[PDB]
Design a protein around this ligand. Structure first.
Ligand SMILES: O=C(O)c1ccc(NS(=O)(=O)c2ccc(N3C(=O)c4ccccc4C3=O)cc2)cc1
Ligand SMILES: *C(=O)CCCCCCCCCCCCC
Ligand SMILES: *C(=O)CCCCCCCCCCCCC
Lengths: 59, 252, 59, 269, 55, 269, 252, 55
């Protein structure tokens, strides 16, 4: 899960295969939204504390 | 429904939303060489999924005046992947192709392309007592272009490129006996041809014989009104089918 | 962009030619800036190891 | 658990598994063999570490308090909540409703305090921890009648032994504890907001049963909660912001993610 | 009244309950049933991959 | 196990078991009855002490660290490796690949430190040892929020009891731990050489949970590894040189053997 | 009879008149990866007869004083044939080897070589707080040589090469637990070892991990009288066995 | 669910596993199978003693 170069993942990139083509009176700027999820062959192992919650004193 | 298509070869996948079916050759689908048609006595190399997968070539702009383009098939993939590294280490090989040409434009654009795969397209020279050089016929994934006016006769090794003779001295409107589809912008945005291996010998060296030539020719020019996109590319994607290689030697 | 909704949006537009890149990020959920605070990525900062396939969807 | 990859050859078909509509609110069920040629793999991986009764079933320190055998602060008071400490709280708030049995474990330590007392000589300390269910008498001093423990659960622990532990049932009046409440307890919709009595589970008191030494000793009790027999319903996005208060969901606005140089760069900043 | 169950392996163990309350028992570690189909695919119509999601 | 000697009488034959070719890379299977007259002996000897799960399955001290209840060095940090200490390390490096489960056992002791503090009077010490899997928060002080141990394994131990112990599974991402790695982790083949992430298995932290005394106490924790459920593949020549570093195979050139006077002398020097 | 041997892999054939049998690994013959041990989910490339065939490396002279030589296995074939062109286009691969070492000399010459294939031979550095560079460990089909005297400690990225420690800090006479044969000049002129794939992972990248190292070490020096040939070469020939590759990408 | 096995002698003992993980079990001491023929005799051709190793 953490950064190591022995278990590097690879790179995910996107390119124009063909230009965005629009007619007159339609915006030539558009957006894409991306989603991510696991498949049904996915698994995780070995519990540990998350680095993403902290405190300095009791709330 | 009938317009959706997906083709999976190796890593690659192509998906289209507008499709005119797939044309298959002369009704012959690519296959490996039989042992009752083979001549060479060595065991073939068959790399499989390292050669047989889609490769995108460079795009080329379709302009209001554009005459057309051509690519000669084994020598347009000769620098690409392990397809290019098996054909310079081997003396022989045979393969079919799946050629997919893409070109998308709005519903306010118009134009028509003819996409043909022409077996053994031998092309004339501007000067009539010379033959073309290999730097005027072969790109390498860059497209060569036709002309709309005759090529002047000098002391040339130039190709005689004119759209209406197709660079071969034939009517261009009769190229429809070759496996073909049209990309008409108000209907479809892609064309798929599947060529089988066509030759008069069972395998052949691929660095001095080009057994197919793809040509994309506008028959109706691109037209649109002010305010529309002015840049419309045409991308060509080509996958080997059932590639074999025989006669392993040194590179060159 | 992280202090807005513009983070989630990926620009694409009509441009001259094609074969220009749109985005690139490395595969490594639970480390990468892109993936560490996604729903997948936060069930993966509680674990040391991960396996399986991931599917990106684009809209 | 984990499923086996199935081999696939070339396709050219009117099937389009890759194309989908994500507007439908449905997560696509595409597997790798759909989009490419794969080999058949046997998987022997399991999803046994990501069970809810593995994720939440480890002891976590929720609080600690101090008390002395002399002067002021003779005892410690704490109202049982798993919301004083960040780490346990965040894990439970992956869910809206949870239901579990506690196991309390107490780590009680003592430390000699600086003084000018000559000839200190501590006897072993014995500590009493008293659980008081909601309502009923509350001790107002060390040496009140409330420490009789006639009907309040209580444990006594002498130093240098194993930590005490006790199990607590599921004590809610509801059918599950709620980690979020979008309402008021008053019908007027005035007063405190997000306050509910489904999560009441008494108060804990702790004291010394003897002052062993002539000098001052200060003890620290640490409380550990371990959920067990867990069931959980309705999952929620993880907390993105730091917690501020233990009774509120209040937050300082935080950016979505950390930054990087470009949308094509392969490193973090 | 002992239960004999299988251990987590890449044998068996024995357990007796000693108390009269079922909140005193050890944690249930080996329950591996799951059903992701409530949160993925909550759609009323059945989605078939290899067919258009929207006709 | 051990095989029984078989009796043999005189020979005079075209058989030649004694003659062999050792160039073939094959160890000859000659037994004593081949080259001489022997009697029949029943052997009841066994090879049960030379099993791999006897050889490697004894506790061995790998490291020890110190920490104090005052001043600097309030806690101890150690990254788990069996390569700090010579004796265990050498035994595992009879093999290239090993696979085992650990059992950690901790011997924690405390020693009063000289001071001019009048009227010291220690309470019993309680120690916390916290295992942190690779990645995740690291304590940067005694009294950080990382010692909450919401999801990190942890033990607490009061003095004058039995040593703690815990079992650890086989934690490799590979199918065996490797004791040797002939490569770089980088694709450029730059940086450190022989460094691999197959042998990661977190970091260990240890502290006092209370300062019992007014005076200074320093503790020492010693970590013992005991392999069990062992499997080992590909045997290697034993180490001939003394180890220098814990991350390298670096050595000072050493002679093959110790000397003696002549090639006919029957004593060592 | 027992001394004649022939090994055919692809185009290549090796023939010897003096042979000490063939040593096979740890009694395991090379095989393809099973589907119950595989992790990677893509279809493998298996080139077959374009990778699995004998490749001769450069010869190196055996002199009266010579200390020995080593070659690190996947990175000594990395520039050769299509073996070298499949391992730079793929992220993964696994292969066994057949190593054949030749060295012929008259019946008036004497000497003895130990030929070992050593799994994961990690080698020390002359300076004790540095590790070797990759230009001191790896040849490319050129042999690296041992030394007979200690390497001085500077501020070095040099290897600590001494024959008697074998560059690993072990006795050199105990390298006989690794698959091995001896070339003794009065008996045999060649040695054959067949290694299976040895690793703790099912496939591994081959451009940053060397999972075997061949070493040829004189134990008895070359000796001959005046009038005999003074130049005796040692040639090494190495063939891949059951090579697979997975994870097709760009070259590099 | 007890196992009864023989002791090392020049009787029998009883063992029960108490934990749900198979990495908590006591060490396997009594596995005595062996096969030295991988490291001795790794040769392809079968060597027969009482016959020349090389013809
Ligand atoms: O060690 C842990 O288990 C432990 C340590 C810190 C912790 N959470 S924290 O937010 O970092 C925190 C940090 C310090 C204190 N804190 C003190 O240190 C202290 C000293 C004296 C009186 C009151 C307090 C007190 O509130 C409380 C909480 C939880 C548990
Ligand atoms: C079923 O429970 C009977 C099986 C044999 C029981 C052995 C009991 C072990 C010792 C008593 C445990 C009692 C706990 C209160
Ligand atoms: C099989 O296991 C039943 C045989 C009789 C068991 C006696 C059990 C001894 C006492 C309980 C040990 C329990 C460990 C969790």
């Amino acid at each position: 899960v953490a950064s190591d170069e022995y278990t590097a993942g690879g790179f995910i990139t996107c390119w124009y295969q063909t230009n965005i083509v629009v007619p007159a009176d339609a915006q030539s700027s558009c957006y894409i939204m991306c989603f991510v999820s696991a498949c049904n062959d996915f698994s995780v192992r070995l519990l540990k504390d998350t680095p993403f919650i902290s405190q300095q004193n009791f709330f | 429904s009938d317009r959706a298509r997906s083709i999976t070869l190796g890593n690659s996948t192509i998906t289209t939303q507008e499709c005119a079916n797939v044309v298959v050759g002369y009704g012959v689908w690519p296959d490996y060489l039989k042992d009752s048609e083979a001549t060479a006595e060595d065991q073939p190399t068959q790399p499989d999924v390292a050669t047989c997968r889609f490769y995108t070539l460079d795009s080329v702009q379709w302009q209001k005046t554009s005459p057309g383009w051509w690519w000669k098939l084994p020598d347009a993939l000769s620098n690409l992947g392990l397809f290019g590294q098996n054909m310079q280490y081997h003396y022989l090989g045979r393969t079919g192709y799946t050629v997919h040409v893409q070109c998308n434009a709005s519903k306010f654009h118009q134009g028509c392309l003819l996409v043909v795969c022409v077996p053994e397209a031998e092309m004339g020279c501007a000067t009539l007592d010379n033959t073309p050089s290999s730097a005027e016929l072969l790109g390498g994934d860059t497209a060569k272009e036709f002309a709309d006016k005759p090529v002047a006769s000098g002391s040339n090794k130039l190709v005689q490129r004119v759209v209406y003779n197709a660079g071969m001295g034939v009517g261009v409107g009769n190229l429809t006996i070759f496996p073909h589809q049209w990309i008409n912008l108000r209907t479809n945005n892609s064309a798929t041809i599947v060529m089988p291996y066509t030759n008069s010998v069972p395998m052949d060296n691929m660095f001095r014989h080009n057994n197919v030539t793809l040509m994309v020719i506008p028959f109706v020019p691109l037209d649109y009104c002010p305010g529309s996109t002015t840049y419309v590319p045409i991308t060509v994607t080509i996958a080997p089918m059932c590639a074999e290689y025989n006669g392993l030697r040194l590179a060159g | 962009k992280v202090n807005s909704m513009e983070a989630y949006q990926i620009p694409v537009r009509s441009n001259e030619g094609s074969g220009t890149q749109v985005f690139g990020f490395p595969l490594q959920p639970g480390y990468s800036s892109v993936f560490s605070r996604t729903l997948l990525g936060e069930i993966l900062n509680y674990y040391t190891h991960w396996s399986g396939s991931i599917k990106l969807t684009f809209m | 658990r984990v499923a086996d990859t199935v081999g696939t050859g070339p396709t050219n078909s009117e099937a389009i598994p890759a194309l989908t509509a994500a507007e439908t609110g449905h997560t696509s069920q595409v597997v790798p063999g759909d989009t490419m040629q794969t080999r058949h793999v046997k998987n022997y991986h399991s999803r046994s570490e990501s069970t809810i009764e593995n994720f939440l079933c480890r002891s976590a320190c929720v609080y600690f308090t101090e008390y002395k055998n002399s002067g002021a602060k003779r005892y410690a008071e704490w109202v049982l909540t798993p919301r004083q400490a960040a780490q346990l709280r965040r894990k439970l708030e992956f869910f809206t409703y949870v239901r579990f049995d506690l196991e309390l474990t107490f780590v009680i330590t003592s430390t000699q305090q600086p003084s000018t007392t000559q000839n200190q000589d501590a006897q072993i300390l014995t500590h009493q921890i008293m659980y008081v269910p909601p309502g009923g008498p509350v001790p107002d001093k060390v040496d009140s009648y409330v420490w009789q423990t006639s009907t309040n659960p209580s444990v006594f622990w002498t130093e240098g032994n194993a930590p005490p532990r006790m199990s607590i049932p599921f004590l809610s009046i509801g059918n599950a504890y709620s980690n979020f409440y979008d309402g008021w307890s008053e019908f007027s919709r005035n007063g405190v907001y997000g306050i509910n009595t489904l999560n009441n589970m008494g108060t804990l008191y702790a004291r010394h049963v003897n002052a062993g030494s002539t000098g001052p000793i200060k003890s620290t009790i640490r409380i550990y909660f371990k959920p067990k027999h867990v069931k959980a319903w309705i999952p929620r996005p993880p907390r993105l912001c730091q917690y501020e208060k233990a009774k509120n969901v209040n937050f300082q606005p935080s950016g979505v993610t950390t930054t990087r140089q470009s949308i094509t760069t392969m490193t973090n900043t | 009244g002992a239960q004999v169950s299988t251990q987590k392996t890449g044998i068996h163990y024995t357990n007796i309950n000693y108390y009269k309350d079922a909140a005193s028992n050890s944690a249930n570690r080996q329950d591996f049933t799951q059903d992701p189909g409530k949160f993925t695919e909550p759609v009323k119509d059945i989605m078939i991959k290899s067919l258009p999601a929207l006709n």
